[PDB]
């Protein structure tokens, strides 16, 4: 693997590592200070919101004021944000650290995507998007895992490690990385609605489950951060392995819509089974398979986007990234507040959004069948 490609992918893996580092720490943060779940969700919600807000301005700066400089500035800002979070005292300083880290993440991603586009040839676009989605997430899953796993001996040393990794990535990028209008008028805008809704639902469900599992297993089974970390990382590993081993086999049998509907029904059934779970090992094993549905949905939505877009793969990738970020911003904000409303209410919210996804996909299938038979 090229060295520059490795550095560029590390710049995203570490960014999503910092994105996910906060979830396993939520229970001790609730206990030691004393708040509601609304603030715990609002942490990640504001991080994703800042990332989404900064992404257009960050991309404009990267295109105009140079690409490498913006990437380096974002990396140093991410390291500074991690260091500040490692030394926080109250809710306001953590809020500011999350906001500035989100801004750094939103100023890094457009630069790295531009570097990927400008370095690899034009015949490696879909593959570049595929790897991009695969790292962006193999990081959004491994973040909470490593953070909770290593947050057992110290209360804030995971953020110190994140800052050290940011400094190392900045140094390595400085040493190694070197870079010496009418496009929206012709868009139909009436056909991308269903994939947009599907990817928004998937991102919202993933983020909502990420917050809700931690909050609910802390409230009910008094889970330690290490237990939550191990469960999350094991579920992510299982989902990734099952996807990479069976996605082609399921794809070669049925179409995308029916597969998505059955996967959503499976997600609902695992959520319902998790409703009545009351034992440590029982809920751990149930969580071990929840991520399977989402990790099977994501490549299906990516393939659907690639097929529906056609020649404009870049526009599809941008829309997918923007709507995934919006879902990640809207998930925890609702999830934590409604958990504060009721402990099991976020589970009902997740099953409701899954039902909305399954009904919209089934009506899109009905429409396709109607104009196919007509």
């Amino acid at each position: 693997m090229n060295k520059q490609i490795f550095v560029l992918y590390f710049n995203i893996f570490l960014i999503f590592l910092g994105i996910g580092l906060v979830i396993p720490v939520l229970p001790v943060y609730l206990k030691d200070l004393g708040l509601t779940g609304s603030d715990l969700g609002l942490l990640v919600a504001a991080f994703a919101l800042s990332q989404m807000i900064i992404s257009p301005f960050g991309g404009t700066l990267a295109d105009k004021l140079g690409k490498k400089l913006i990437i380096c500035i974002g990396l140093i800002l991410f390291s500074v944000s991690e260091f500040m979070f490692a030394v926080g005292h109250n809710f306001s300083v953590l809020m500011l650290s999350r906001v500035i880290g989100g801004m750094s993440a939103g100023m890094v991603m457009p630069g790295v995507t531009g570097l990927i586009a400008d370095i690899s040839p034009s015949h490696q676009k879909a593959k570049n998007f595929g790897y991009m989605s695969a790292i962006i997430n193999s990081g959004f899953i491994l973040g909470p895992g490593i953070g909770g796993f290593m947050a057992e001996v110290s209360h804030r040393m995971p953020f110190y490690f994140a800052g050290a990794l940011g400094i190392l990535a900045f140094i390595m990028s400085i040493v190694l990385i070197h870079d010496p209008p009418q496009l929206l008028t012709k868009i139909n805008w009436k056909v991308f609605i269903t994939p947009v809704i599907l990817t928004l639902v998937l991102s919202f469900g993933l983020s909502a489950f990420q917050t809700l599992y931690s909050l609910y297993t802390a409230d009910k089974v008094n889970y330690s951060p290490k237990d939550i970390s191990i469960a999350i990382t094991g579920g992510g590993i299982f989902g990734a392995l099952f996807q990479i081993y069976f996605f082609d086999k399921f794809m070669k049998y049925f179409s995308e819509l029916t597969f998505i509907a059955w996967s959503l029904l499976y997600s609902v059934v695992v959520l319902i089974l998790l409703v009545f779970a009351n034992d440590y090992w029982s809920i751990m094993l149930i969580s071990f398979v929840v991520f399977i549905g989402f990790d099977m949905i994501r490549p299906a939505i990516t393939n659907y986007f690639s097929n529906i877009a056609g020649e404009r793969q870049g526009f599809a990738g941008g829309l997918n990234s923007t709507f995934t970020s919006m879902g990640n911003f809207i998930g925890p904000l609702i999830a934590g507040a409604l958990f504060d409303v009721h402990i099991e209410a976020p589970i009902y919210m997740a099953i409701g959004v899954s039902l909305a996804g399954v009904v919209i996909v089934l009506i899109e299938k009905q429409h396709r069948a109607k104009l196919k038979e007509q």
Binding site: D63, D118, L183, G318, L319, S321
Partner: peptide, 15 residues
């Protein structure tokens, strides 16, 4: 003539 400019939320490749 290869050069990518950044429109909103996405990178477009110059004609």
């Amino acid at each position: 003539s290869v050069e990518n400019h950044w429109y909103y939320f996405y990178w477009y490749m110059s004609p």
